[PDB]
């Protein structure tokens, strides 16, 4: 398989731009992500998939967060429902001391590498609950 023959704007280095996506895809867009990853959950090398650094890393974090929500069942290396998990589930210490109001420790949600997606509500979406 190769590029579909209808590129919205040819002459683009990042295939994330050749179709006008650069600030437009989320983690749950599994269709977009499921063609940048090997048959075993791991990302393809940049020097092949051709993305730029700032889009390669965003796709990487998106595919991590996609795996952690169980959105790619058939890409394994052969109890709790979670989504938008930045940290690996087995490397986070509980918040035993959530400080006072003015030094609160808040739980990360989503990734900050997607800080620049097209917003659609006036209140910007929170990266830390």
């Amino acid at each position: 398989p190769k590029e579909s023959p209808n590129p919205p704007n040819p002459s683009g280095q990042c295939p994330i731009c050749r179709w006008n996506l650069k600030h437009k895809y989320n983690y749950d867009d599994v269709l977009l992500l499921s063609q940048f990853i090997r048959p075993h959950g791991g990302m393809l090398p940049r020097k092949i998939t051709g993305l730029c650094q700032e889009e390669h890393r965003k796709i990487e974090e998106c595919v991590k967060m996609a795996h952690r929500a169980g959105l790619l069942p058939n890409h394994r290396p052969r109890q709790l429902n979670r989504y938008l998990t930045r940290w690996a589930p087995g490397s986070v210490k509980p918040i035993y001391k959530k400080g006072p109001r003015w030094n609160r420790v808040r739980m990360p949600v989503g990734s900050p590498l997607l800080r620049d997606n097209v917003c659609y509500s006036r209140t910007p979406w929170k990266l830390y609950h």
Binding site: G12, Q13, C14, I16, C17, K22, C52, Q53, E54, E55
Partner: peptide
């Protein structure tokens, strides 16, 4: 590094530098 009066804080926040957005993102175009 002492704290500022609140109104001076608001003045510092409103007058904060805003940079001119580049016409195109360098990653996807020279």
């Amino acid at each position: 590094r002492r704290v500022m009066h609140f109104q001076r804080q608001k003045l510092m926040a409103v007058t904060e530098y805003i940079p001119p957005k580049p016409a195109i993102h360098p990653s996807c175009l020279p």
